[PDB]
């Protein structure tokens with residue numbers, strides 16, 4: 102039935118995580134035909150249990166049966182590529198620390214404490230936990246870097262970054278966006294503000310240890326907020342934008358690089374629930390960004406689409 | 420992409436868990452048109468968070484939008500009933516003790532000590548964990564009872580239990596199968612063997628505190644094993660069937676009431692992986708049931724399909 106298939110959906114995601122996390126996926130590179138017997142011996146997995154997992158992966162369309170051999174479906178080739186967006190998503194969002202948060206989503210909904218499912222599960226915030234977990238931070242950084250790679254060319258095409266001399270990436274993390282921007286836009290002062298244990302050093306990028314909820318440094322022409330605002334409640338988002346305005350002088354701009362909810366959104370609605378589970382965050386309509394900005398003596402000057410999900414929103418002082 | 424949609428499938432299951440477990444689904448019974456702001460009050464969930472959940476439930480086809488009101492799709496009407504088989508499956512299968520066990524599935528595959536993901540997660544077997552919490556024992560019981568209520572009509576339509584005078588349900592738990600059977604098949608000696616803290620009292624059904632891995636009592640005409648064999652390794656399944664054979668007089672029968680693996684039997688392939696995660700159990704082909712029976716000193720006498728998933732296998736002395 103439709104309902105039965107929806108209820109048991111999670112088993113498909115868990116099986117794909119096992120396929121990658123156990124190292125099975127490595128053996129399926131370049132459309133290779135794989136003997137399950139030899140695969141069991143290579144990976145140190147019980148033959149019968151591996152054969153049953155392969156039968157499940159065949160049923161859901163990940164693998165294709167070829168008698169005594171199996172192959173990765175050409176539609177799913179990305180699972181054999183560790184640097185593919187899909188492989189990076191599997192290694193991050195299906196990891197135990199993420200997975201286990203979802204079973205506390207109902208409790209979080211009834212609590213009305215503001216505490217997200219992830220915090221109920223782990224007893225600390227997502228970024229507090231990420232700072233304490235080397236492997237999760239590595240998987241997170243790898244995905245962030247891949248997203249930077251995916252959008253950078255379209256971003257440089259639709260927005261003139263050349264007009265700004267001093268650019269601060271607010272919550273820029275490992276700074277992959279400005280790294281890829283500095284490859285094509287030259288002779289600029291690039292800075293990244295985030296929370297660092299050890300301040301990363303990188304030629305052409307100044308890294309600043311700070312807190313954007315308290316203060317943002319003045320003297321920058323462009324302030325960038327990529328995938329930051331959607332982590333926060335309305336009041337905390339307004340606080341960040343108020344702190345941007347306080348840092349800004351006449352002529353300066355804020356550029357939000359954000360998913361945007363739209364009437365015809367499907368992927369964004371799907372992603373919005375993950376933001377609730379991890380952050381008590383949310384994806385916002387343009388009209389919601391309008392109000393947030395207004396409250397911070399800022400105003401939307403322009404909006405452009407990168408793709409189906411991501412838009413850029415230029416703010417100026419109100 | 421097909422692959423990205425499979426990776427993020429788990430969010431559908433988690434949203435359904437929130438829909439049922441928070442008590443939201445109640446307000447959608449009998450095809451009711453629901454106002455989300457009004458629903459926000461009756462269930463005490465933040466309007467914005469609830470509206471975002473409902474948007475997600477609309478996207479995946481659980482809810483249908485009717486202007487400024489939402490209904491539960493006819494195909495998913497079972498979710499509005501908190502004691503439906505589907506609602507009880509949702510509240511057990513997607514609850515933390517079971518959901519979080521899937522995080523240890525990869526580790527379980529690489530360890531090869533026969534310990535299921537669930538045991539690695541909780542430091543004890545599924546039935547030990549159930550024994551350690553009276554509430555968790557009881558929730559599983561509500562589900563098993565609804566599954567028995569689901570198939571008893573079809574069982575009674577195709578199999579004559581009237582031909583047997585003394586019937587023992589091996590691992591029959593709270594005895595719901597024999598209670599329902601006793602309404603239609605009267606004048607029988609009914610008995611249930613399981614591991615009890617307090618032996619159930621229910622009219623003149625003989626509830627026996629025992630261990631089917633050690634001994635099965637003699638003097639029954641029919642020995643029933645419903646949804647027992649799939650909980651066990653080949654070795655433990657043979658042990659159970661051998662303990663039946665050791666107790667069986669001439670003319671006595673064993674009736675297996677079990678899911679059976681068949682080509683692209685979706686529900687059974689899906690359940691096979693769940694049985695690995697919970698029990699280091701498995702779903703089996705008819706040929707596999709025949710080998711287990713032959714090793715135990717039993718022969719298959721009759722095979723009948725109850726529905727697309729469930730079959731009955733009658734066994735006699737070899």
Ligand SMILES: Nc1ncnc2c1ncn2[C@@H]1O[C@H](CSCC[C@H](N)C(=O)O)[C@@H](O)[C@H]1O
Nearest residue numbers: 245272273274295296311312313314327328
């Ligand atoms: N109070 C705070 N002050 C500064 N940075 C913060 C912060 N709270 C969270 N952050 C940072 O905000 C970022 C959110 S994730 C976005 C990272 C980056 N802009 C990208 O798009 O890839 C993280 O790097 C996190 O460390």
Ligand SMILES: Nc1ncnc2c1ncn2[C@@H]1O[C@H](CSCC[C@H](N)C(=O)O)[C@@H](O)[C@H]1O
Nearest residue numbers: 563590591592613614629630631632645646
């Ligand atoms: N060693 C053992 N001896 C007896 N019963 C056992 C057992 N190990 C597990 N069981 C029982 O086996 C049952 C498996 S679940 C199936 C229950 C019932 N036949 C039904 O179809 O609804 C549980 O009731 C569990 O308590």
Ligand SMILES: [Cl-]
Nearest residue numbers: 138139142148
């Ligand atoms: Cl071999």
Ligand SMILES: [Cl-]
Nearest residue numbers: 669670671736
């Ligand atoms: Cl006989």
Ligand code: NA
Nearest residue numbers: 121124126127
């Ligand atoms: Na791999």
Ligand code: NA
Nearest residue numbers: 591594596597
């Ligand atoms: Na029973």
